[PDB]
Amino acid sequence: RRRVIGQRKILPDPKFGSELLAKFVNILMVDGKKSTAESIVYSALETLAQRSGKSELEAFEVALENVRPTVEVKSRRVGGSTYQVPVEVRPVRRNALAMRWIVEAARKRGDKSMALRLANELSDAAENKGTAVKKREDVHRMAEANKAFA
Partner RNA sequence: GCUUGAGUCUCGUAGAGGGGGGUAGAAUUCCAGGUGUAGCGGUGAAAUGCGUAGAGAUCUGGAGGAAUACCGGUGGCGAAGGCGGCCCCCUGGACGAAGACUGACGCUCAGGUGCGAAAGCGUGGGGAGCAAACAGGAUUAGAUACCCUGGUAGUCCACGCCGUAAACGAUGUCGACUUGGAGGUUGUGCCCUUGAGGCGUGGCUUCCGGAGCUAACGCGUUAAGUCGACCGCCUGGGGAGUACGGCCGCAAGGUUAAAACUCAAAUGAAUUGACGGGGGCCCGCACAAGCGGUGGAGCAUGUGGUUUAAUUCGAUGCAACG
Partner RNA sequence: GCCCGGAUAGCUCAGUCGGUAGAGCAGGGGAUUGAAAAUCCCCGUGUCCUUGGUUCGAUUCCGAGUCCGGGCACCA
Q: Name which of 27 and 114 has its Cβ closer to RNA.
A: 27
Sign of the CA dihedral 134, 111, 19, 6?
positive
Q: Name which of 74 and 112 has its Cβ closer to RNA.
A: 74
Residue 57 contacts which entry, RNA, another protein, none (Cβ below 5-8 A, type-dependent):
none
Hey, is 102 helix, strand or coil? helix
Q: Name which of 46 and 72 has its Cβ closer to another protein.
A: 72
Give the DSSP H or E segment for 37: helix 34-46
- 114 sits near RNA (criterion: CB under 7 A): no
Count CB atoms within 10 A of the CB of residue 16. 13
Residues in 131-150 at the binding interface with another protein, rule: CB under 8 A = 146-150
